[PDB]
Design a protein around this ligand. Sequence first.
Ligand SMILES: Nc1ncnc2c1ncn2[C@@H]1O[C@H](CSCC[C@H](N)C(=O)O)[C@@H](O)[C@H]1O
Ligand SMILES: Nc1ncnc2c1ncn2[C@@H]1O[C@H](CSCC[C@H](N)C(=O)O)[C@@H](O)[C@H]1O
Ligand SMILES: O=C(O)c1cc(O)c2ccccc2c1O
Ligand SMILES: O=C(O)c1cc(O)c2ccccc2c1O
Lengths: 328, 328
Amino acid sequence: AAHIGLRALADLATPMAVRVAATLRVADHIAAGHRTAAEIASAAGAHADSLDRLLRHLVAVGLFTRDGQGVYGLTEFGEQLRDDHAAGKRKWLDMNSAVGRGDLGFVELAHSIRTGQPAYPVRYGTSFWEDLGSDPVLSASFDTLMSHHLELDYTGIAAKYDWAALGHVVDVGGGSGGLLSALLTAHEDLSGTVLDLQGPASAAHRRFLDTGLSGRAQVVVGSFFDPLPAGAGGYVLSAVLHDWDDLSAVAILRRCAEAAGSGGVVLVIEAVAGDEHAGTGMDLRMLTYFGGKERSLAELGELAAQAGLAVRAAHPISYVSIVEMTAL
Amino acid sequence: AAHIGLRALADLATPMAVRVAATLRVADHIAAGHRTAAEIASAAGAHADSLDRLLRHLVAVGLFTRDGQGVYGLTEFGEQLRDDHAAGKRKWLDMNSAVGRGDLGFVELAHSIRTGQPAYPVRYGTSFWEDLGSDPVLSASFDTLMSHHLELDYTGIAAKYDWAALGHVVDVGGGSGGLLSALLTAHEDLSGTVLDLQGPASAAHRRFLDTGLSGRAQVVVGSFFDPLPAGAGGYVLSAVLHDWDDLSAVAILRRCAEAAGSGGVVLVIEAVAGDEHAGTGMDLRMLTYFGGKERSLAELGELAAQAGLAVRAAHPISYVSIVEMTAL
Ligand SMILES: Nc1ncnc2c1ncn2[C@@H]1O[C@H](CSCC[C@H](N)C(=O)O)[C@@H](O)[C@H]1O
Ligand SMILES: Nc1ncnc2c1ncn2[C@@H]1O[C@H](CSCC[C@H](N)C(=O)O)[C@@H](O)[C@H]1O
Ligand SMILES: O=C(O)c1cc(O)c2ccccc2c1O
Ligand SMILES: O=C(O)c1cc(O)c2ccccc2c1O
């Protein structure tokens, strides 16, 4: 990019206008029949006049079309704004979801860049997890979004690795049990345990009960900073490490190392720096949310090193990687 | 006219990253001689490693360039990020200027389009003017910024209208007197008085003293919501009306009508919703800041009506318009 005006490249009005449309579900109200500002507004519960000005800006962006007596219609693009779209982006943009709300934490980016600390707290006076831990509905939405990322990224991951060979896997921080689920459903004879906080663990359990996996699927509420269910064949750290700073990440890694002993493997499944799903933007998001960071195969090794582990493999999956570490 | 991906359209990381680069004067430190994250960060007072991550993202965006070993350079675009660049953009983005800080108020857009009220208060617990009133340095930056818009928008306005014919003009909300100054520096037998709040008025006065215009130019501190210096030839309302909602606008207008009388002429000089610079993004900004509105020649006319005035001309000069109203 960068071919657009510097002021345009720095524009906030548009990205904010798009996010607001997503939150009012304007695209849904248009397809559902309400095609004029007065209607969409009363339908979404917005200020009729102000809402019109928003739309006008959005027809200009190329998300909506307006004509004659001000009848709005989604464009080939605006289509992606409705909840029932394949992509399922509206939920990430909606300002009520964990991510849609948390991304507004970017307005405090300056803080992070000046102190190397998360900016989310500067905006919401608390850590992201603390926030999700005290808002069940918010935490619920995060579980939903992460569940969605499993699809977008881990397509066919069950096959790309020799899971069965593990016998029993602990999904450290595998909230909502989507990955473990997709893993067991694809490899019978294999059992697992999802370890996460009350919120996700409660959803993982609910999941296994319905998919009829409670026989091989176990849940255990707890922090991955404390001893983990020891002796498993494998310990997966899926989309966890990048959520933490270096110190924390090695702590998390050691716990896995310990529980794994000289008999198991520690599989970190993340978007290592270089993957088609790992950008500088994700890294910035990681920094602004918790002061985490995307890391390279190299940087992960430096960490594994400080935990008594050693990278022995790296198989690239669909958009991310499966870094396999064992004790050294 | 925006084909790039929805997620990219709603992106906040980049706009914020640019604004932070502006505020940290990153481009200036690079051209000055600090080409390394560690250097540029120490020269900017930022956190070395965090900044490196920001730069990396801005390199990716296309504003900077990096060689191995972390050396950075400005791209042809990165230039515009310099504080001495022709455009003079950096200061509008800087989070310390009235606008660079006020735009972060967009993060509360949802509130405005939801209620019709301004959003700036939501984020700063006060109005824009209240803020500038209690922060003289802030107000100072706003004065210089608007001064900059004079050059960008009003280029040649001197001749575009028969000023000298008015004898004496009162620039209602004249700011630091940049406009009035230009008009007098072009019409030797023309006198005028700038009306504004303490902050701008004294900057206007300081100007007239350094440019020997104190003889034909004077300032008067006061709210344009109370009686104005009466009997002038013309009353100019430059970039004022769109900073206000309709009711407040007719208020300000009635005052001008009154002051002018059956013998004066009220001149609204602002980018009508019509064309050029005025846009939906501007209109959104006006709503976000004060519940203001960018209006059409009709919308203005409707307002003038309520103030006993009647549009009688509209010479489009440069990228904005000067609509001449008189008592009906
Ligand atoms: N201290 C802690 N102990 C255990 N789990 C934690 C934790 N802090 C955060 N988590 C969990 O770490 C997970 C990271 S988010 C996504 C992780 C999951 N493997 C996935 O990609 O879907 C979340 O489920 C979060 O609830
Ligand atoms: N109640 C009030 N009375 C007088 N001036 C006011 C005011 N409220 C705001 N202003 C001034 O209105 C101006 C609007 S922005 C700058 C306008 C200037 N004519 C540039 O004339 O084009 C600012 O200078 C602001 O300080
Ligand atoms: O896209 C992902 O994989 C991803 C993973 C995460 O663990 C996140 C945690 C907090 C916020 C966003 C996250 C995120 O976007
Ligand atoms: O561009 C302009 O003419 C303009 C005029 C204004 O009165 C503003 C007031 C507050 C914030 C931005 C403003 C602005 O950008």
